[PDB]
Design a protein around this ligand. Structure first.
Ligand SMILES: */C=C/C(=O)N1CCC[C@@H](n2nc(-c3cccc4ccccc34)c3c(N)ncnc32)C1
Length: 300
């Protein structure tokens, strides 16, 4: 209940160039692009999200919710909005995360990812997520596909489509949901907590440790609820020492208050990132003149 004084910045269509398409799908369309704030003498590499040319009234309501949330965050491990552009087709402008999402990155680079990288990513994500806990904000769709990569050393949490600002729970109408990342209480009772986000964290860590495997690859979504009730969980990844897998399993307790808190998760993975070969066992560990990254373009 502190007042949210974040500025929403509105961008003229003239200010930014679309260079190339990064992706299209359910979301709409994403472009690599370049932004020149007028009068400023900088050039900022950006990504631009347009809706799939939809003029739908529910669709504009959706991205403006996303815009809302993105505009209200400020953390090195969380993706922030740069601006919106109120063309007939509404556009979200954010920082360009050149290496795409982390899921695709671990897959593309399996044979070259060391323990130091994996554990540092885990730490960075726990930080992002802890920042969101401080801001009383529940992600609801944490997964490896929703973590973007600025550089291989630096990743940020994103996709706030489903993200909901809080007292101590959120209750939903189903829509579509990422069932395989969801806490049990969320599947059964449509309840979402920070601690429910921890479950999703667990599964995300698991996605990284298996270099992009699909959780429950075989199983149909309908089935999941029952399995977790039985007590089955995801398997221990080959690279994982018991110390690491233990932490994943703790994220997957039935009793959500018995799960760890992101602040604790930072600590554990930090200790592990200090001596990373003790905790993960992997074969082979061993014009642009005026360009400025978004993280150096502060405006107030
Ligand atoms: C593996 C992730 C993935 O498959 N995609 C699809 C290709 C486009 C990728 N992408 N998305 C964003 C992104 C995410 C959330 C919000 C916004 C808002 C405006 C513009 C983009 C986004 C990407 C960004 N910011 N940078 C590079 N690629 C991005 C995700």
């Amino acid at each position: 209940e502190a007042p949210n004084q974040a500025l929403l910045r509105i961008l003229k269509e003239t200010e930014f160039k679309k260079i190339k398409v990064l992706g299209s799908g359910a979301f709409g369309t994403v472009y690599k692009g370049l932004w020149i704030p007028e009068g400023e003498k900088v050039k900022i590499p950006v990504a631009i999200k347009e809706l799939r040319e939809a003029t739908s009234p529910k669709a504009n309501k959706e991205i403006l919710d996303e815009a809302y949330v993105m505009a209200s965050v400020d953390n090195p491990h969380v993706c922030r909005l740069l601006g919106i552009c109120l063309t007939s087709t509404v556009q979200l402008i954010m920082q360009l995360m050149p290496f795409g999402c982390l899921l695709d990155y671990v897959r593309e680079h399996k044979d070259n990812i060391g323990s130091q990288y994996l554990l540092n990513w885990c730490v960075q994500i726990a930080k992002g997520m802890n920042y969101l806990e401080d801001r009383r904000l529940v992600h609801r769709d944490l997964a490896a596909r929703n973590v973007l990569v600025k550089t291989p050393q630096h990743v940020k949490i994103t996709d706030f489509g489903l993200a909901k600002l809080l007292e101590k729970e959120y209750h939903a109408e189903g829509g579509k949901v990422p069932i395989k990342w969801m806490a049990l209480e969320s599947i059964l009772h449509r309840i979402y907590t920070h601690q429910s986000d921890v479950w999703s964290y667990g599964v995300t860590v698991w996605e990284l440790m298996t270099f992009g495997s699909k959780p429950y690859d075989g199983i149909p979504a309908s089935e999941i609820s029952s399995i977790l009730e039985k007590g089955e969980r995801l398997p221990q990844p080959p690279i994982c020492t018991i110390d690491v897998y233990m932490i994943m399993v703790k994220c997957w307790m039935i009793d959500a208050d018995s799960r760890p808190k992101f602040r604790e998760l930072i600590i554990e993975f930090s200790k592990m990132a200090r001596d990373p070969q003790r905790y993960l066992v992997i074969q082979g560990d061993e014009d642009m003149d005026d360009v400025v990254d978004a993280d150096e373009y502060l405006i107030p």
